[PDB]
Design a protein around this nucleic acid. Structure first.
Lengths: 209, 123, 50, 39, 125, 136, 52
RNA sequence: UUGAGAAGCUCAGACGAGUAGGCAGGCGUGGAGGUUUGUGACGAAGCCUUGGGCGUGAGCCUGGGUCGAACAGCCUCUAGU
RNA sequence: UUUCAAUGGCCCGUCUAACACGGACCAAGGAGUCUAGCAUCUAUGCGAGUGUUUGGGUGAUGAAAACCCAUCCGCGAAGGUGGGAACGCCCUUGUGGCGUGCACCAUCGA
């Protein structure tokens, strides 16, 4: 009843429906994955239809800060559905539009690192990264789903440590920040995705173990 | 680049000077009895690919600008970015009024109109 | 593109995200008389274009 | 603040490898081609 | 367009039935538009042309010359008006054929037949 | 052969992709994928869903994660009752083959989606079909 | 949607009609070549039109 | 450095008669659909020319005279070409 | 362009060295076209299938077009061993080794 307005052809209607989703999403209940897969087919097109470079790079942040609005239980469900729906239809783009769906990925990967910082003050981060790592093990970095394209993970390696440093300027503590990228290059059957992934990664071994 | 021609005399079909039924446009002879086909010396020459002209100074008038048929007032507009490599040749059936308005605008675009003077006596 | 309209030169730009709206497809910027100002106004509008 | 088209971010990284890996074989060529000019 | 299979659109069939129509068809093909002062009092767009009407010529080189029709020449498809006469070399005068579609009727030669056509065809007296 | 005999302008596109991939990489896969798109329709014969399932899954049944790749048409065999979990990548799929792979199995790809999954063509099988009509 | 249907669903106003599909999955071939899937693996490029 | 009609652009070498024959690209004529916000009584088509221009060529564009109602370029289809 | 000078230049086509045969000239006409059958190659659509047009239904805007289609019917209807396309893992970088080996060809099975 709500999504088919997010794919309107008027930015005065698309955005007018976006801020009311902030009311719709902060509800304290349980959401099923497909319901977040149908909602994430609206915010794809809410961002697929984005005209100006000073609006789409503001729309991305309004999508990025939408994650802390999600309830604590389904906050990790909401990002898992995005990385699926940003890997299911990444081949449908062209170069004149990938440039704007890279920054949405850059924000959401960074918006994850921000939420671990928020969750690290409630409970120890060693479990918070693991269940976040779990979300990485059934989303992009899952091995058995060969359909997840390379262009996501090549860009997911370049923005991994740099927006870890951006959200943690003082010092990021030791955790399994790179464990997704180690289990990926070890057994994933995309041959180039295990060969040239280390050549793209900027992993920092001084603080990790 | 200075324009050059490998030949200036066109080719003229054999014995198209004697007979008035035979036209002057070139036609390669088809008989092996022919003196011309076997290319006996003294007979006329033939069109071959040897006389092909330079692939850059082709289609160029002796000035250096290639031609372009402008048959209305929005056909000279395309020549705005090409005024130093094209000459706006006006088409023949264009009226002697629609002609006098192409000239007054091609002159603003600095384009050479080759035959702007037709039907146009100035005062 | 750049194309004049009644004395003053304009700059017309299009994008993918307005392609399906042929009325609103092309936007417009009016280029200043100062020739060095107009070059510095094309670049600031056409940034990171090829 | 327009940022950048981050496609052009990853051309400026692959052109730090293209420059370095051939500007290295510029001194190592010019120092090499002083041996053979004598030899 | 036309949507009848019992009308003809070929130039051949239409341009033959015109030039070889009999002299009763050749009457209603020679009709004249009424003047703007008669178009509102008879409510008739056009009348077929009678003899002794009161017309004015709108088109042609004989522009605006008023008169009355002398001999409605149904054969060569033209009216013949009073005193609009091209000269001849010999000294006599010749009549100028004005097309029946060019004249504008200013006063009808009202008769019992025309009135019984006027009163039914959209108007009155 | 240097240009396809066809006028399918969705197949000038593939040739525009694999004759780029032939010269910017060191794989002879792309210099074999391109070397087949030029071949005429009688030179790219069909290959069934059973011969594909027999080629990969035999001897040791090495069918771990390799994408079978035929530049032809993946037709059907209905004498095959159960279909294994396969993954193919061809130009054309017949509508009874594409519904007999997905019903219990994997992925159906065009050579577009192949070039974004194995850009140098590793972990693949490059099969053909039988050219033999036995008299024609 | 009932005259032509879909690519995997029968058009309702036509017996045994399914909409065709494509030999290229993405309808745009000069925007795979420039993707991150290709330009990571390719060998070092040569120059443009070469010097004489 | 922009030279991406990737059916484009660019670099370098060798070669050049040609019969029967084989292959390829184009030129022109009458009609048909689409297109040129197409040309035309301020002169369309045609015709003539000791005028100019292009193409290797088939051909095309044009100035002057004549003349008086229609006509052409581009992409396809078609043949009593 | 007209002409002059110098140098060259056996009349064209059909024939079989010359010939012969055709040629007074000019204009317009004028000759591998249509159809059925078979085969090759290529293109496209679908594919163990494929083919609407004998018909029927429909078609208000050339309604002989386009569009839809029942019942027949026509054409068709899983052996090892060597190479060998390609692709992994190699470590003698490669070389070579190592594994899976498509079409096609030999070899022994039926």
């Amino acid at each position: 009843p709500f999504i088919k307005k997010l794919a309107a052809n008027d930015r005065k209607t698309r955005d007018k429906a976006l801020e009311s989703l902030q009311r719709f999403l902060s509800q304290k209940k349980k959401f099923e994955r497909l319901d977040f897969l149908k909602l994430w087919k609206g915010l794809f097109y809410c961002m697929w239809m984005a005209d100006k470079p000073l609006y789409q790079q503001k729309l991305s942040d309004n999508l990025a800060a939408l994650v802390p609005i999600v309830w604590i239980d389904n906050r990790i469900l909401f990002q898992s559905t995005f990385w699926e729906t940003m890997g299911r239809e990444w081949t449908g783009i062209d170069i004149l539009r990938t440039d704007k769906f890279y920054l949405l990925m850059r924000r959401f990967c960074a918006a994850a690192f921000r939420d671990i910082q928020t969750r690290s003050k409630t409970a120890l981060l060693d479990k918070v990264v693991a269940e976040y790592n779990q979300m990485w093990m059934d989303g992009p970095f899952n091995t058995e789903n060969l359909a997840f394209p390379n262009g996501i993970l090549f860009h997911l390696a370049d923005i991994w440590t740099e927006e870890l440093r951006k959200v943690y300027p003082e010092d990021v503590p030791k955790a399994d920040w790179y464990l997704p990228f180690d289990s990926t290059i070890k057994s994933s059957h995309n041959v180039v995705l295990r060969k040239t992934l280390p050549k793209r990664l900027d992993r920092v071994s001084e603080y990790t173990k | 680049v200075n324009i050059i021609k490998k030949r200036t005399k066109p080719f003229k079909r054999h014995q198209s000077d004697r007979f008035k039924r035979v036209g002057e446009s070139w036609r390669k002879p088809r008989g092996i009895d022919s003196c011309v086909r076997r290319r006996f010396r003294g007979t006329i020459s033939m069109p071959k690919i040897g006389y092909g002209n330079n692939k850059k100074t082709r289609y160029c008038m002796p000035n250096g600008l290639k031609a372009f048929l402008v048959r209305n007032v929005s056909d000279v507009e395309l020549l705005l970015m090409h005024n130093k490599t094209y000459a706006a040749e006006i088409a023949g059936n264009v009226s002697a009024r629609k002609r006098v308005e192409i000239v007054e605008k091609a002159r603003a675009l600095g384009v050479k109109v080759t035959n702007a003077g037709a039907k146009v006596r100035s005062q | 593109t750049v194309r004049e309209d009644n004395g003053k030169l304009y700059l017309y730009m299009k994008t993918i995200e307005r392609a399906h709206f042929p009325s609103k497809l092309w936007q417009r910027i009016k280029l200043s008389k100062n020739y060095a100002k107009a070059l510095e106004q094309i670049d600031q509008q056409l940034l990171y274009w090829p | 603040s327009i940022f950048a088209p981050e496609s052009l971010l990853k051309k400026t990284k692959a052109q730090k490898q293209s420059r370095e890996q051939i500007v290295a074989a510029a001194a190592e060529k010019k120092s090499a081609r002083q041996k053979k000019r004598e030899l | 367009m036309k949507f009848s299979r019992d009308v003809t659109s070929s130039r051949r069939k239409q341009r033959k039935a015109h030039f070889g129509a009999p002299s009763s068809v050749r009457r209603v093909l020679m009709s004249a538009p009424l003047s703007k002062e008669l178009r509102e009092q008879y409510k008739i767009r056009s009348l077929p042309v009678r003899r002794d009407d009161q017309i004015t010529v709108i088109r042609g080189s004989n522009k605006g010359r008023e008169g009355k029709i002398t001999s409605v020449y149904r054969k060569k498809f033209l009216l013949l008006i009073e005193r609009v006469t091209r000269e001849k070399a010999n000294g006599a005068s010749a009549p100028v054929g004005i097309d029946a579609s060019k004249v504008v009727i200013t006063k009808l030669h009202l008769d019992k037949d025309r009135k019984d056509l006027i009163v039914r065809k959209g108007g009155k007296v | 052969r240097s240009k396809p005999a066809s006028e399918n302008v969705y197949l000038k596109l593939l040739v525009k992709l694999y004759r780029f991939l032939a010269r910017r990489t060191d794989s002879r896969f792309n210099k074999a994928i391109l070397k087949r798109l030029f071949q005429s329709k009688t030179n790219r014969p069909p290959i069934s869903i059973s011969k594909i399932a027999a080629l990969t899954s035999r001897k040791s049944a090495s069918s771990q994660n390799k994408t079978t790749v035929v530049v032809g048409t993946v037709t059907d065999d209905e004498r095959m009752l159960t279909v294994p979990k396969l993954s193919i990548a061809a130009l054309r799929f017949t509508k009874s083959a594409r519904a007999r792979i997905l019903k219990a199995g994997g992925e159906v790809l065009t050579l577009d989606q192949l070039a974004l999954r194995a850009p140098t063509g590793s972990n693949t099988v490059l099969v053909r079909g039988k050219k033999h009509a036995r008299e024609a | 949607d009932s005259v032509f249907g879909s690519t995997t669903e029968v058009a309702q106003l036509k017996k045994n009609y399914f909409l065709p599909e494509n030999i290229i999955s993405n309808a745009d071939v000069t925007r795979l070549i420039n993707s991150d899937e290709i330009q990571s693996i390719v060998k070092a490029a040569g120059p443009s039109r070469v010097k004489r």
